[PDB]
Each structure stands twice: as structure tokens, then as C-alpha cells.
Design an enzyme around this catalytic site. Structure first.
Site, PDB file in Angstrom:
ATOM      1  N   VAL A  54      41.674  -0.272   3.065  1.00 30.31           N
ATOM      2  CA  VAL A  54      42.206   0.836   3.848  1.00 30.31           C
ATOM      3  C   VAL A  54      41.166   1.948   3.861  1.00 30.31           C
ATOM      4  O   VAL A  54      40.789   2.468   2.803  1.00 30.31           O
ATOM      5  CB  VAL A  54      43.540   1.344   3.282  1.00 30.31           C
ATOM      6  CG1 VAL A  54      43.975   2.609   4.004  1.00 30.31           C
ATOM      7  CG2 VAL A  54      44.601   0.270   3.389  1.00 30.31           C
ATOM      8  N   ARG A 183      42.205 -12.269  -6.453  1.00 31.61           N
ATOM      9  CA  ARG A 183      42.064 -11.970  -5.035  1.00 31.61           C
ATOM     10  C   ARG A 183      42.033 -13.288  -4.280  1.00 31.61           C
ATOM     11  O   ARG A 183      41.271 -14.189  -4.645  1.00 31.61           O
ATOM     12  CB  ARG A 183      40.789 -11.160  -4.773  1.00 31.61           C
ATOM     13  CG  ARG A 183      40.839 -10.272  -3.544  1.00 31.61           C
ATOM     14  CD  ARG A 183      39.642  -9.328  -3.502  1.00 31.61           C
ATOM     15  NE  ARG A 183      38.374 -10.052  -3.553  1.00 31.61           N
ATOM     16  CZ  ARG A 183      37.795 -10.609  -2.496  1.00 31.61           C
ATOM     17  NH1 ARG A 183      38.374 -10.529  -1.307  1.00 31.61           N
ATOM     18  NH2 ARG A 183      36.642 -11.251  -2.624  1.00 31.61           N
ATOM     19  N   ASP A 308      30.370   4.036  -5.769  1.00 29.52           N
ATOM     20  CA  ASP A 308      30.871   3.437  -7.003  1.00 29.52           C
ATOM     21  C   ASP A 308      29.906   3.624  -8.165  1.00 29.52           C
ATOM     22  O   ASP A 308      30.338   3.670  -9.324  1.00 29.52           O
ATOM     23  CB  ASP A 308      31.153   1.950  -6.790  1.00 29.52           C
ATOM     24  CG  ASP A 308      32.537   1.692  -6.229  1.00 29.52           C
ATOM     25  OD1 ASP A 308      33.177   2.648  -5.743  1.00 29.52           O
ATOM     26  OD2 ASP A 308      32.987   0.527  -6.284  1.00 29.52           O
ATOM     27  N   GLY A 321      35.982   3.583  -0.814  1.00 26.40           N
ATOM     28  CA  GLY A 321      34.980   3.541   0.239  1.00 26.40           C
ATOM     29  C   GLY A 321      34.879   4.849   1.001  1.00 26.40           C
ATOM     30  O   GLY A 321      33.780   5.309   1.320  1.00 26.40           O
TER      31      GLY A 321
END
Ligand SMILES: Cc1cc2nc3c(=O)[nH]c(=O)nc-3n(C[C@H](O)[C@H](O)[C@H](O)COP(=O)(O)OP(=O)(O)OC[C@H]3O[C@@H](n4cnc5c(N)ncnc54)[C@H](O)[C@@H]3O)c2cc1C
Length: 430
Positions: A54, A183, A308, A321
Site C-alpha cells: 500500500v 508470504r 529501510d 516505502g
């Protein structure tokens, strides 16, 4: 029409990483008149149909000012999901809540967004060198640089390091978790036959659906895609036990993901869905977290960490992000305003603009992480608004904000005055 870059600033920039921070810093620097080279160790952008992310409106507005073609390029990759159905570890309904941003953000795939930004950067004529592993950072008076593939030395006015959580730049700048995340991605053909799992396909042709389970130190999220023909899921859990003197390679088994869910009283419906995962489409990545650093800037002032590498988040805030994008924009904007002969000032300026905003969110993800794994079910029952997914984040424009305060921050770093950060809430808490 592609935006034409500003007049050459005379500032050469080395950007490390083809992630969100690196691509952002490279594109924004290029358009602001800087001379950019981007170094990335991989040969291609990794494509994973299950790597859903997102991007918040605060970063979408920045990306949009790089070209209108991008909105029409990412549109078919945007999920039409609107709500997330929260449930406890007993598989009991808590609440449905809107996803953040009021539909102004981007819920899409990572590799497909990175590929679009990679291509848009090439159309702009930016020197992007793939298969280029960066190491041995170095710095002198007036210049800094890196060693590529232990054969080539590069030198520039500054080095912006966006090499991720596993940052060698961080270790060089400083000299100094226990959680993991399954994941996965899958097609729903086999799952549609299973009546214990077919429930997840309900209402998927109309709209992508999101289900999230919280409880007993475990988080699980399931997301449908492409009119219910595909789905992806993520299971945050305590890291798998490994022996003292044990094989140093990675591992991922669906049986461990299923075993992780066995203590849940409401394990049936989630487990009935994920047990259809093929082993080739499953990973189990350890989550890296480090507390806020003392500084993102080297002693010489020409090497700076962003993204990061500087501020790794617990993935519960949906702003990792986006904050890396804000990092890259402010850094590039600050370099333009300080000029050639004040590169160290610009990076000192960008640091004091970005550090408070990224650190509040960083610590905010650490606090929210405890509450979502071991919740106080009394308060949730009294007021379900806690669990569920801030205008001071999503409505912010780092660019115009940087223009407002630049002189104020310059005078603050130099010592002429003080800086009151207003890109975070007063008495800053997340
Ligand atoms: C489970 C999970 C879910 C998440 N969900 C979201 C989300 O929904 N929204 C969101 O905004 N964020 C999310 N994040 C966070 C987001 O993934 C990161 O914050 C973002 O990728 C960081 O950007 P970056 O550019 O700093 O790092 P990266 O994207 O990690 O980029 C670093 C790049 O540097 C390259 N590199 C590394 N070392 C070297 C080297 N030595 N030389 C050259 N290149 C190198 C790597 O190949 C990599 O390409 C999530 C994270 C996790 C773990």
C-alpha cells in the site's frame, strides 16, 4: 510529455539501491538538475504476484509529479479493495474498516510498480547500472564514493544509500528481532472445490476482499485478487527455531505455517485456505528491526542513509516505502537549495527534516506491533476503532514543507536559531 529536468546543479550523486528510496532519490535528483548514477546489485526487478503493498497518498502525490503516464500505467495493477475484515484468533468477527487513504492511495504489486518507475527513469535518461554490487564506502574532503564489484571506484559530491534493511552502508556509517513473515500467492482453482475454503471467494468478482486475523502472538492477512482468480497471504510469526551450529540457508514449509496456526481455536477457516499453497510460491522472511539511529549522515557529511537502511518499520503502518519516497524527495530538494558548495549542509538539513517524521512512525510501528499481537480484547470490545487502520501523514507534502522550512533548518544546523518540526503532531506520538 516527460518532465524536462532543471538546469544542471553541478552536483553529482551516487544512489545505491533500486528500491523505493533509491529510485525516488534518483528521479527527483535528475529532474532537479543533478547528475545521477544509480547502482543496483540485481539484474532485473524481482516479480512476485504475492508482494502486495500500500502506497499512501503522501507518496502518490510525489510520484504523480514525475509524469502523468504513470497513473495510466499502474491503473490496471491497482486493487479495488475498500475494507479489511478484522477477526480474532477465535475466528470471530471484530469489525470491517476502510483501508487508509480514503481511496487516494495505491494498493498494488511491488515489482510492477518498481518496474514502471524503473522504465520511467530510463525514458528520462538516467544512468542506471544493474548487476552492480556496492561495497567499501569511502569519504574524503569534497567527495565520497563506493567500490562496485570490487573492481571499479566511483566518486561524487555525495552518496545516498538506500540499500535496504541489510545495509552495508549502515554498518560502515555506524561501525556497529525474533519475528518472521510467511508470504505466499496462489490461484483459487483447487481452493474453489474445497467447501471448507471456498468461503474466501465470496464477493470477489465484484471487489477484492481482505481478511486479517489477530491474536496470541500471530497475525495473518489474506487478500483476494483478479476477480477471485488469485489470492495472496502473509503470516507474521515468531522466527523458526534453528540449532546452534546449523545450516546457514533459508527454508519455508507450509506445514510450519499450518503448525503456527494450530493453537488458534479459530484455525479451521484460515488453515483450510492456506493449505492449498504450492511450495514453490511460499517464502518465510525474517523481519529486521533496529531502533532509531543517532544520525543518518557520515562524519564528513557526504554519505547519507535513507529508507529501510535508516528507519526499518514493523509492517503494520503501511508507510515504509512512502517514507522512503519522502526521504528521496527531501534529500534531492535539499541538495538543490543548498548548492554545490553546501552539499554537507543539505544532507544535514534533510536529516533534521526527515528524522522526526520517520522516527515517530518507526516507534509507532513498534508500539502498534505489541497491541496487534497480544491485544486487550476488553478495550477492543468496548471500542473497535483501535485495531482498525492520520491526516498529518497522508495529507502531508514533504516537498512544499521542505521549501517552507529550509532557511529555518539551515539556521538551526548552523546554530543561528531553533527548528520547531511541524511535519509531526505536537507532542509527537503515533
Ligand atoms: C511484510 C512487509 C510488508 C510491507 N508492506 C508495506 C506496505 O504495505 N507499504 C509500504 O509502504 N511499505 C511496506 N513495507 C516496507 C517496504 O517494503 C520498505 O520500507 C521499502 O521497500 C524500503 O525502501 P528501500 O528503498 O529503502 O529498500 P528496498 O526496497 O529494500 O531497496 C533496497 C535495494 O537495494 C539493493 N541493494 C541492497 N544492497 C545492495 C548493495 N550492496 N549494492 C547494490 N544494491 C543493493 C537491493 O537489491 C534492493 O533492491 C513492508 C515491509 C514488509 C517486510
Amino acid at each position: 510529455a516527460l518532465p524536462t529536468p532543471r538546469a544542471p546543479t553541478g552536483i553529482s550523486v551516487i544512489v545505491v539501491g533500486l528500491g523505493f528510496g533509491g529510485l525516488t532519490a534518483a528521479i527527483e535528483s535528475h529532474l532537479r538538475g543533478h547528475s545521477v548514477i544509480l547502482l543496483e546489485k540485481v539484474t532485473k526487478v524481482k516479480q512476485d504476484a504475492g508482494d502486495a503493498i500500500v502506497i499512501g497518498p503522501n507518496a502518490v502525490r510525489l510520484i504523480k509529479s514525475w509524469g502523468e503516464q504513470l497513473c495510466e500505467e499502474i491503473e490496471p495493477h491497482l486493487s479495488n479493495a475498500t475494507h479489511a475484515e478484522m477477526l480474532d484468533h477465535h475466528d470471530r468477527f471484530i469489525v470491517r474498516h476502510e483501508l487508509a487513504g480514503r481511496g487516494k492511495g495505491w494498493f498494488t504489486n511491488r515489482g510492477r510498480l518498481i518496474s514502471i518507475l524503473y522504465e520511467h527513469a530510463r525514458k528520462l535518461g538516467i544512468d542506471i547500472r544493474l548487476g552492480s554490487r556496492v561495497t567499501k564506502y569511502w569519504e574524503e574532503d569534497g567527495r565520497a564514493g563506493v567500490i562496485v564489484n570490487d573492481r571499479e571506484r566511483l566518486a561524487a559530491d555525495c552518496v545516498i544509500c538506500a540499500d535496504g534493511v541489510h545495509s552495508a552502508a549502515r554498518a560502515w556509517l555506524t561501525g556497529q528481532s525474533g519475528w518472521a513473515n510467511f508470504r505466499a500467492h496462489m490461484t483459487t482453482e483447487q481452493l474453489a472445490k474445497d467447501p471448507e475454503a471456498s468461503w474466501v471467494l465470496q464477493g470477489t468478482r465484484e471487489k477484492d476482499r481482505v481478511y486479517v486475523w489477530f491474536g496470541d502472538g500471530i497475525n495473518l492477512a489474506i487478500m483476494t485478487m483478479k476477480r477471485g482468480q488469485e489470492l495472496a497471504w502473509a503470516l507474521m510469526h515468531t522466527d523458526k527455531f534453528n540449532a546452534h551450529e546449523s545450516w546457514a540457508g533459508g527454508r519455508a514449509s507450509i506445514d510450519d505455517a499450518l503448525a503456527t496456526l494450530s493453537p488458534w481455536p479459530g484455525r479451521l477457516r484460515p488453515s483450510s485456505v492456506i493449505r492449498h499453497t504450492l511450495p514453490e510460491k511460499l517464502v518465510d522472511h525474517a523481519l529486521i528491526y533496529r531502533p532509531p539511529l543517532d544520525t543518518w549522515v557520515s562524519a564528513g557529511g557526504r554519505v547519507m542513509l535513507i529508507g529501510d537502511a535508516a528507519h526499518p518499520y514493523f509492517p503494520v503502518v503501511g508507510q515504509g516505502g512512502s517514507q522512503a519516497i519522502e526521504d528521496g524527495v527531501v534529500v534531492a530538494t535539499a541538495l538543490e537549495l543548498a548548492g554545490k558548495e553546501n552539499v554537507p549542509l543539505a544532507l544535514r538539513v534533510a536529516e533534521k527534516i526527515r528524522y522526526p517524521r520517520a522516527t515517530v512512525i518507526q516507534l509507532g510501528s513498534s508500539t502498534l506491533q505489541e497491541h496487534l499481537f497480544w491485544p486487550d480484547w476488553e478495550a477492543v470490545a468496548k471500542d473497535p476503532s483501535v485495531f482498525a487502520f492520520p491526516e498529518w501523514i497522508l495529507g502531508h507534502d514533504c516537498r512544499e514543507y521542505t521549501h517552507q522550512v529550509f532557511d529555518t533548518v539551515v539556521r538551526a544546523v548552523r546554530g543561528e536559531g531553533e527548528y520547531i518540526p511541524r511535519n509531526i503532531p505536537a507532542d509527537g506520538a503515533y
